[PDB]
Ligand binder design. Structure first.
Ligand SMILES: O=c1nc[nH]c2c(CNCc3ccccc3)nccc12
Ligand code: NI
Ligand SMILES: [Zn+2]
Length: 330
């Protein structure tokens, strides 16, 4: 069995290897990459997402989100307070202001320390979940707006045509901007490209141990857990690496830098934070291997984790017994 310790693996595809997306995902899994829940892909030196990022300042962040924390330094939840609209230009200036800027630090390790020590005492503002793409239409390899659709993957595997579209999202980040512990909708894969700016630090639990994370979460957020059997789908719970280590939870960490892709694999729980002003682009995708995961994915039916009309079909075809209840929650 490849990668039995579930280490995060880093790949350096050649330009020829970067042509066929599906084939390279499959190659990665042949080397056991999926066991980690997350892989880093460094593009060939010949490749670029687009020519420059000089002209992105007029992009609108219609609903910037202030991430307000509650709890203790290593075990907290965050809620999203909507803020007034701003452009990327305005957001970048805000991120660089004294109130929000990255503090002086020696290295990524020092900064991670500072993050977990102090995150809860601030409320950074995240330009999250903006429909759009920064890939040039002429970029033919690993263009997140031109991947096979999940709806076509389902159709090809299972024979049924369904409604729905899958498009990418942009994330404009600043220091302490946080993504909570989660797997993707329907335990899909995701791909994340860091277009510009400061790093993004990731934590990931191997898919084979996801239930260990879930158990700890029910213990650490007892009220949330009573409220919903799949509350991690709300995407509000943070648990620090120190707490995971204290509780014997298997996990790994890595820092993503501008120009690098991260792929998360089905049922790979992940969380993390931004080091400073940055922009990432992300989308979900599927492969034939995902279908079994999709069939078994736990659903939030409590009303909190409202999602896109896109998931309807996935639940309806893959999880017919759960569909009615899940629908009531939507
Ligand atoms: O860095 C991040 N900032 C916000 N959400 C993140 C998430 C949430 N899931 C990924 C996703 C986003 C959009 C569409 C489909 C899937 N995963 C990984 C990193 C981040
Ligand atoms: Ni994600
Ligand atoms: Zn719920």
């Amino acid at each position: 069995a490849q990668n039995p310790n579930c280490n995060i693996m880093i790949f350096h595809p050649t330009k020829e290897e970067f042509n066929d997306f599906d084939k390279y995902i499959a190659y990665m899994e042949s080397q056991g990459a999926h066991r980690a829940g997350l892989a880093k892909i460094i593009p060939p030196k010949e490749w670029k997402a687009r020519e420059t990022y000089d002209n992105i300042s007029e992009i609108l962040i219609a609903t910037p989100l202030q991430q307000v924390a509650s709890g203790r330094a290593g075990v907290f939840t965050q809620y999203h307070k909507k803020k007034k609209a701003m452009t990327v230009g305005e957001y970048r200036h805000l991120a660089n202001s004294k109130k929000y800027q990255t503090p002086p630090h020696q290295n990524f390790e020092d900064l991670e320390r500072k993050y977990w020590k102090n995150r809860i005492y601030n409320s950074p503002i995240y330009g999250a979940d903006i429909s759009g793409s920064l890939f040039d239409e002429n970029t033919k390899q690993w263009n997140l707006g031109h991947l096979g659709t999940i709806q076509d993957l389902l159709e090809k595997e299972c024979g049924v045509v369904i409604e729905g579209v899958n498009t990418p999202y942009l994330y404009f980040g600043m220091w302490k901007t946080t993504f909570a512990w989660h797997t993707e909708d329907m335990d899909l894969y995701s791909i994340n490209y860091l277009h510009l700016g400061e790093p993004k630090t990731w934590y990931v639990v191997p898919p084979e141990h996801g239930q260990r994370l879930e158990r700890l979460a029910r213990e650490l957020f007892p009220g949330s857990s009573r409220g919903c059997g799949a509350f991690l789908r709300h995407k509000v719970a943070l648990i620090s690496p120190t707490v995971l280590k204290e509780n014997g939870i298997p996990f790994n960490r890595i820092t993503q830098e501008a120009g690098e892709f991260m792929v998360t694999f089905p049922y790979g729980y992940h969380a993390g934070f931004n080091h400073g002003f940055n922009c990432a682009e992300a989308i979900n995708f599927a492969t034939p291997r995902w279908i079994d995961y999709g069939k078994m994915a736990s659903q939030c039916s409590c009303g909190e984790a409202r999602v896109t009309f896109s998931m309807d079909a996935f639940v309806r075809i893959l999880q017919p017994e759960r569909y009615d209840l899940w629908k009531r929650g939507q």
